[PDB]
Ligand binder design. Structure first.
Ligand SMILES: CC(C)=CCC/C(C)=C/CSP(=O)(O)OP(=O)(O)O
Ligand SMILES: CC(C)=CCC/C(C)=C/CSP(=O)(O)OP(=O)(O)O
Ligand SMILES: C=C(C)CCSP(=O)(O)OP(=O)(O)O
Ligand SMILES: [Cl-]
Ligand SMILES: [Mg+2]
Ligand SMILES: [Mg+2]
Lengths: 285, 285
């Protein structure tokens, strides 16, 4: 089975049109049955590679790295790189749908980022709020289920609430799930699962001796997230930087040199073709 | 400073001579103070690169992968490759001392390797027992502090016992610490810390709302293990396979294509040179 969408007609809408910022997402033909719309094709009009379902990653995690560097190299303010990265998120979501990926986790704001200047942090909080607000209806139309993954302390209420609205609006979608990870840290996530387990123990609802690896997994914030199959990071940095820490224990790493504002869905597809050539054993044989 | 040992005299003993098995570890001249002996130099007589201490990794973790394929490519039984890996362990210990590395974690058997055949599991358990018995006096003489890291259920008692003797005999050594990781799994290690935390809660000695990331770290099996700075894996596989999961959250990954039985201390040094040259990102420790 090859779960790629059939190639788009030559005149099907494309994405992204970078002649404006924010980028205007194209109107799409209404879906016949009334379900999700077919995503716009890339402006190159490349088509997704034919990868069989048993060699496709179910869950791709991406550390979207290189935005500030991209801007500084051009003599632009670092925030201009983040701005350009918004369209890349949407392009990669479209390409993931075209390829057949069912889960996509995006590292939008790390807990490490509180070390940045408070001005850049304020920009990044407001920008993530704005991206979700600006793109939630497009994501809904594409069949995306999106929700927040992350930690509460210090995170703006407006960001949590904007994502909660998007989650409620897309809860029944099932083309692809996006974990939009904001104020996320893998050790912190595990710690919060351990706290919840501890609360249940204190209340007499859980015997400590019954705790297993599955107990931890069931007490993570979003226990429906599957293991990460393919872990991507741009800009040449070869670190997972605490992203999807529990979930990516057996992930394949494919570290790519392009900066995130230069990335497009063809780069995602190339990493997925490389993944498909690999053999995963999970400690067996 | 530059904490490397200087090049050895031309006639200083070398290691390893893989023309016999078990490999012979050479007699070494007594150390002046009566302390640890200078390790034998590599057969090639290469000397460790001059890397300043602030640029060296404090803690290197190594997944010792590719032993079985090394043997199968030669028409040998898989476990002949593991036998060749023993000399490589000791060569890498010697090279880590020459370079100035203070912490080395070695992945010798995972919690997932029980999925292998009973024949191969029996071999690997007995082999790890035998490696520790054969080499702990040598490691002691070099100033290595070695001890077991891993999970107790299923692990053979003979392995735990040999490592317990090695731990007691080297507990005062301080040239380098080797975490010898057998029946190790990062998710399981975290689970066991969470269990201990839960026992403290049930006993009224720990409040859930006082649990922090440091609480988890303090309840890992070996809480003195520092973060992994540099994570290496041989054989061309680009995955961490649940090794040092909490500790390597922020590590740099270097994937080396050589199979473990072909590896030597110069390959460890090459990876450390790459690590030392990498530009360190904003906010990193
Ligand atoms: C582009 C979007 C929507 C989110 C990613 C923003 C973000 C906080 C990335 C973290 S790494 P970055 O700021 O990009 O790193 P540098 O090249 O500036 O060193
Ligand atoms: C060298 C020593 C002391 C222990 C070897 C530890 C060990 C089982 C490493 C994995 S190599 P393995 O996965 O068995 O070999 P491949 O199938 O991946 O070629
Ligand atoms: C080195 C070890 C003792 C275990 C990790 S290497 P292993 O071959 O188990 O890892 P996978 O390729 O994921 O199966
Ligand atoms: Cl630097
Ligand atoms: Mg394994
Ligand atoms: Mg292997």
């Amino acid at each position: 089975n090859f779960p790629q969408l059939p190639p788009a007609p030559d005149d099907y809408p494309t994405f992204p049109d970078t002649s404006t910022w924010p980028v205007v997402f194209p109107e799409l033909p209404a879906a016949p049955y009334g379900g999700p719309c077919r995503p716009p094709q890339h402006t190159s009009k490349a088509a997704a590679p034919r990868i069989p379902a048993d060699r496709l990653p179910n869950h791709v995690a991406i550390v979207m790295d290189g935005n500030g560097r991209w801007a500084t190299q051009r003599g632009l303010a670092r925030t201009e790189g983040h701005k350009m990265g918004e369209a890349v998120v949407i392009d990669i979501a479209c390409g993931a749908i075209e390829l057949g990926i069912k889960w996509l986790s995006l590292y939008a704001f790390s807990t490490e980022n509180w070390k940045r200047s408070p001005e850049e942090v304020r920009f990044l909080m407001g920008f993530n709020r704005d991206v979700v607000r600006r793109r939630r209806d497009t994501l809904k139309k594409l069949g995306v289920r999106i929700r927040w993954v992350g930690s509460r302390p210090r995170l703006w209420r407006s960001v949590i609430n904007e994502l909660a609205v998007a989650e409620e609006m897309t809860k029944s979608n099932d083309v692809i799930t996006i974990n939009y990870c904001v104020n996320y840290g893998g050790r912190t996530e595990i710690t919060e699962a351990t706290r919840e387990i501890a609360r249940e123990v204190a209340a007499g609802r859980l015997n400590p001796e019954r705790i297993t690896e599955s107990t931890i997994a069931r007490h993570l914030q979003r226990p429906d997230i599957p293991d990460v199959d393919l872990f991507l990071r741009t800009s040449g940095e070869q670190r997972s930087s605490n992203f999807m820490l529990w979930q990516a224990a057996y992930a394949e790493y494919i570290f790519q040199d392009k900066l995130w504002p230069d990335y497009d869905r063809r780069d995602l597809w190339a990493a997925c073709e490389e993944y498909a050539s690999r053999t995963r054993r999970f400690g067996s044989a």
